[PDB]
Amino acid sequence: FQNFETLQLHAGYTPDPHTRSTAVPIYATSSYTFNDSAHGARLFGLKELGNIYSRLMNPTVDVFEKRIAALEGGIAAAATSSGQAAQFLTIATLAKAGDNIVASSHLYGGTYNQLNVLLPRFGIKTKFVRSGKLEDYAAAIDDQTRAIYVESMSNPDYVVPDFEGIAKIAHEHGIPLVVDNTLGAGGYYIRPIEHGADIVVHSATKWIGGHGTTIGGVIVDSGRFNWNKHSDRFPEMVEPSPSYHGLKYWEAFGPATFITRIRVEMLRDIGACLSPFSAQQLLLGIETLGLRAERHAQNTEKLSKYFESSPNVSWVLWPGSESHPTYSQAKKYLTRGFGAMLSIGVKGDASAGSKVVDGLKLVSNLANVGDAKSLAIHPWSTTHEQLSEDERLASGVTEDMIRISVGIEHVDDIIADFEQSFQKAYG
Amino acid sequence: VFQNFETLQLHAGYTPDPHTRSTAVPIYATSSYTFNDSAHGARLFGLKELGNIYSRLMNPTVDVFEKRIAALEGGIAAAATSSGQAAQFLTIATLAKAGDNIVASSHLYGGTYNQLNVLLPRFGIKTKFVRSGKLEDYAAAIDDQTRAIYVESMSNPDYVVPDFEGIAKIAHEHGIPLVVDNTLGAGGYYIRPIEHGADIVVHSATKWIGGHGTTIGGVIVDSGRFNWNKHSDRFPEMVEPSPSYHGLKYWEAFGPATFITRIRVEMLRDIGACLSPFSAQQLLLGIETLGLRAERHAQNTEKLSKYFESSPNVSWVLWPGSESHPTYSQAKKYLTRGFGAMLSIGVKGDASAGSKVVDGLKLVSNLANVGDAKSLAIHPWSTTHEQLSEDERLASGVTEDMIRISVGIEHVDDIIADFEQSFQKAYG
Ligand SMILES: C=C/C(=N\Cc1c(COP(=O)(O)O)cnc(C)c1O)C(=O)O
Ligand SMILES: C=C/C(=N\Cc1c(COP(=O)(O)O)cnc(C)c1O)C(=O)O
């Protein structure tokens, strides 16, 4: 099947012949009993594929991994306990002390802090690029570079990168392109592997889960980056491995080498694993991902038209807008809806934004995106609080910005909620 | 304020909320927590007010799990993680950075040894291993870049018990904390290392704490007893203006809670190895019977060691309650509520015999875990310690003839009977 709406219900699971359970069971088990002692030794020796221990694999999580990989067009995936952990495990596999990665400066505030503050005390530095220009990405690469890292639509100014031009630069220098596709809704709005991304990461907490119940992340491997070809930057992908008695990953696993290392090195030793309970919550969300993402983007388009005519709004920021700075990229890469987000500024002083948010009765003020319920937050004092004012500006965040995650409520009710709040704030 | 472990494991850290009056701990399957207003959200994010923000960082179900474990161990506070490995990783990553080292015992669970010997050096954090257990070797390995001494309260799978008070004395005299993995101490039932000088205790909650083999999880417990200010030369991030929080000075704001606070507002926030509330609820169900289970585990282990000691089919028994145990003097001193839930044996004959004995068991399960209510057996040489070199396995007490047994709470006569019938089959 290659329709998204079909894969999100069927990919990665067949009822086992023992129980024939139609729905995916929740394998609430830490462990898996060996057939015999020799079988256990083959499992720990990576000589036979099979369930060993839920810090590394779990059959509920396996369905979640296979289904997200199918939706994104990757070969395989690995779940983590959060979007933050998905990014951390990915960079930790590609880079070590003395390496760097090149990243867009337009990031979720928590990713910016991860790259700018946390990773450097492990020896891993980031060179940020603000302009989006191909030549500035090229000029930032040096011999210690291990990836280019961008968000598919930055949180919360919705910069769409030139995926194909950046992938070309990355690949000419022998480094992978890593894309955080959280705001791409599990591949529905944007499938970065189709435009050159080698590795895709998600906070599954957001549109993938869809209901604000569960934290989770996932790492998708395209299988398309020839590590052996570029083993001067990635020796651990081909050289004998100190943690598996000289196993050579590329020779053993080929295009699955990166995602194999994520599991047998990083999940095994860092241990940021996903619960099967969490995975089942996320699978329920995935079963309607296409439907929700479609309605989200329809409501977002309609709500932006309302905001564009509202005398109470000073500006609307929406990647579907012909005024958007990267509208030419949005137009090329987003052909199934221009996302589920918009940001606005409202008229008046510094006080006005908080007054409009606080007066909403349907929209919830909290930290999340991609709930079925509509959400609002002030990134300058929350999601991007840890950044300096200059860093906020380099990420498109300003003191007057209100970030809106548009839900699937009836759009007349969303609009009516803003209307009554505007009339309490302004008359 | 309660005295007894048995009472704390049911009541510490939870009072029914007055909205619902729910007697049992609810499962807060929520990513987020709605602000009262915009200014409230700003105070939460600015760390100006205590309150729920987002479940990568805090969650009310996980919070009960955390407080209850802290109360059982005698710490001021705890932070849950997605696994025992993650509890270790986040702890060392807070204390140390690239260019630093820690000193650790060489008697470790194989996954920890590989974490310290292979993973962390990639981040420029190296470990100096001490094989002897002697106080003077721990002292000698400390240099100016050392950031901790790390030991298991009873090592997996040879059950070395460390001289807690002597090692703690060395650590504190050099201005570094003592970090103890108390996994095999069963949540503080068998051993409470904070009472003996440990500054920080980590657990795999996957084991006796959860007790049913359903759930992976970890937890970090801060004693609150290490003075980060006295030793800001080795730990400047504990006192110096913080780049994550606009110059916040942690010690000056949080005092004895500084380490556990950084674990949350730096490591869980940016590494994100959080525990789900569904997992915390499974673990809370286990904790409600931890003292009862640990008591029966140890009672069954004592009786099973008696059985193996009189069996013609056993070459040796390894049990920290044995007067022949290399660290029996430390076990007797620090284990006064039962000598653990574990033993290891070697069986007579050639190399294939341990394998046939385990394969012949029909009640005991051959799998990777410890601290299930069900009895378990495994061959660590080819499993839990498979990643280590042979010399590294010896230095951790693992032999090729070792069978590790996690003794369950089944009726001990059924456990003995299972080994007996498997012994006839293997040996006639
Ligand atoms: C409250 C968190 C928010 N965003 C999280 C996020 C993450 C991290 O994922 P988690 O660790 O939270 O699962 C990664 N990438 C992007 C694009 C993100 O927006 C938000 O509301 O802005
Ligand atoms: C299958 C795993 C086993 N042990 C795990 C373990 C860990 C890691 O914790 P998790 O990441 O597994 O929660 C930490 N410390 C000790 C002492 C441990 O024994 C085992 O069966 O030997």
DSSP code, position B99: T
Nearest alpha carbon to residue B206 among A275, A49, A82, A43:
A275
**Any idea what DSSP says for residue A116?**
I
Contact between B174 and B233 under an 8 Å Cβ cutoff? The reply is no
Query: How close is the nearest chain A Cα to the Cα of B143, in Å?
Result: 20
Could you tell me which residues come within 8 angstroms of residue B427 by beta carbon, excluding any fewer than 6 positions away? B313, B348, B349
The torsion region of residue A131 among left (phi > 0), alpha (psi -120 to 50) and beta comes to alpha
> Which ligand 1 atom is the nearest neighbour of the CA of A205?
13
Phi, psi of B90 (to 5 degrees): -65, -35
B144, amino acid identity: D
Contact A289, A71 (CB under 8 A): yes
Distance CA A320, CA A355 (A): 27
Q: How far is the C-alpha of A342 from the C-alpha of A346, rounded, in Å?
A: 13
- Decide: residue B391, CB within 10 A, 0-12 exposed, 13-18 middle, 19+ buried: exposed
Give the residue among B114, B111, B384, B394 at the shortest CA–CA distance from A43.
Answer: B384
Are B32 and A377 a contacting pair at CB < 8 A?
no
Note whether A367 and B44 are within 8 A (CB): no
Q: Decide: B147 and B168 in contact? Cβ < 8 Å.
A: no
What is the CATH topology of the domain spanning A291-426? Aspartate Aminotransferase, domain 1 (3.90.1150)
| C-alpha closest to that of B348 among B403, B277, B390, B415 | B403
Domains of chain A, by residue range, sit at 4-284, 291-426
Into which CATH architecture does domain B5-285 fall? 3-Layer(aba) Sandwich (3.40)
Exposed, middle or buried by CB within 10 Å (0-12, 13-18, 19+), for A120?
middle
Q: Cα dist. A380→A344, A383, A388 in Å?
A: 13, 7, 10
CA distance A137 to A394: 15
- Ligand 2 centroid to Cα of residue B378, in Å, is 13
Quick one: tokens of B88? 């270790």
CA distance to A192, A193, A322, B77, B309, per residue, from A164 (Å):
9, 10, 21, 49, 70
- Taking only residues 16 to 55 of chain A, the set having a beta carbon closer than 8 angstroms to any beta carbon of chain B reads 28-34, 36-38, 40-41, 44-45, 52-55
Q: How far apart are CA B12 and CA A181, in angstroms?
A: 42
Rounded CA gap, A69 and A51, in Å?
20
- Experimental method used, please? X-ray
Scan residues 165-204 of A and list those with Cβ closer than 8 Å to B: none
The runs of H, that is alpha helices, within B160-289 are 164-173, 250-254, 258-262, 269-270, 277-287
The amino acid that residue A360 corresponds to is L
**Under 8 Å between Cβ of B90 and B267:** yes
Tokens of A240: 């004998």
In the block, residue with structure tokens 């004395």: B169
Task: Confirm or reject contact between B76 and chain A (CB < 8 A).
Answer: no
Strand partners, B160: none
Mutate to test the pocket of ligand 2, among B370, B388, B393, B407 (most ligand atoms within 8 A of CB): B370
Tally C-beta pairs within 8 A across A and B.
239
Mutation probe of ligand 2 site: the residue of B65, B89, B156, B160 with most atoms within 8 A of C-beta? B156
> Shortest Cα distance from B428 to chain A (angstroms)?
20
**What's the CA gap between B57 and B76, in Å, rounded?**
18
CATH code matching the domain that covers B290-427, chosen among 3.90.660.10, 3.90.1150.10, 3.40.50.10490, 3.20.19.10: 3.90.1150.10
- Tell whether the torsion through CA atoms of A133, A138, A139 and A142 is positive or negative: positive
Whether the Cβ atoms of residue A275 and residue B279 lie closer than 8 Å to each other: yes
Which amino acid, one-letter code, is at B348? K
**Interchain contact A231–B (C-beta under 8 A):** no
A268 lines ligand 2 (CB under 6 A): no
Q: If DSSP codes are grouped into helix, strand and coil, which group holds residue B174?
A: coil
- Report CA-CA distances (Å) from B313 to A380, B36, B308, B406: 70, 68, 8, 19
Q: Is A393 helix (H, G, I), strand (E, B) or coil?
A: helix
- Tell me the C-alpha distance between B363 and A389, whole Å: 63
Decide whether any atom of ligand 2 lies within 6 Å of the B81 Cβ.
no
Q: Are A175 and A230 in contact (CB under 8 A)?
A: yes
Query: CB-based contact (8 Å) between A239 and chain B?
Result: no
- DSSP code of residue A193: G
The answer to whether the CB atoms of A273 and B368 lie below 8 A apart is no
Resolution in A: 2.0
Q: Which CATH class is domain A4-284?
A: alpha beta
Name the pairing type of β-strands A145-151 and A177-180: parallel
Query: What residue ranges in B235-321 does DSSP mark as E strands?
Result: 314-318
Q: How far is CA A359 from CA A315, A372, B36, in A?
A: 19, 20, 11
> Is the CB of residue A105 less than 8 Å from the CB of residue A128?
yes
Region of residue B47 (phi > 0: left; psi between -120 and 50: alpha; otherwise: beta): left
* CB nearest to A358's CB, from B31, B38, B206: B38
